[PDB]
Each structure stands twice: as structure tokens, then as C-alpha cells.
Amino acid sequence: TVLPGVEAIGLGYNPFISYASVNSGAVQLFDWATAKKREVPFKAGYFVPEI
């Protein structure tokens, strides 16, 4: 499974419209459905892009 929040990082963003929210900022820029995935060391069964 993907780690929750990996869809939100890399989101194109506007800093002026509002404070930290997914509703400030447009669309995901990165193909992280397809990148090489590493398991996160402190949660077994959860993966993120190696980057």
C-alpha cells in the first residue's frame, strides 16, 4: 500500500491563497504511481517512492 500523503507531496502549490491545505494548490506533478518504491522502515506494508 502507498503511505497516506504521498499523493499530496509534490502537489503544485500557491502560497498566497491560504495556509497549508490541499485546497491551495493545483495538481500533482509527479508520476509516483510508477516510480521505484521503498518500504517505509517504521510501518511494514507501506511504501513510498525511493526519492
Partner 1 sequence: VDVQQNDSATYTNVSGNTISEYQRSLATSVAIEGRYNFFSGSLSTDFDSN
- Binding stretches for partner 1 (CB under 8 A): 4, 7-8, 11, 22-23, 27-28
Half-sphere exposure of 34 (CA within 13 A, CB side): 3
CA-closest candidate to residue 9, choices 19, 20, 18: 20
Residue with cell 495538481: 27
User: Min. distance of Cβ 5 from partner 1 in angstroms?
Assistant: 8
Whose Cβ is closer to partner 1: residue 7's or residue 37's?
Answer: 7
User: Min. distance of Cβ 28 from partner 1 in angstroms?
Assistant: 5
Whose Cβ is closer to partner 1: residue 4's or residue 15's?
Answer: 4
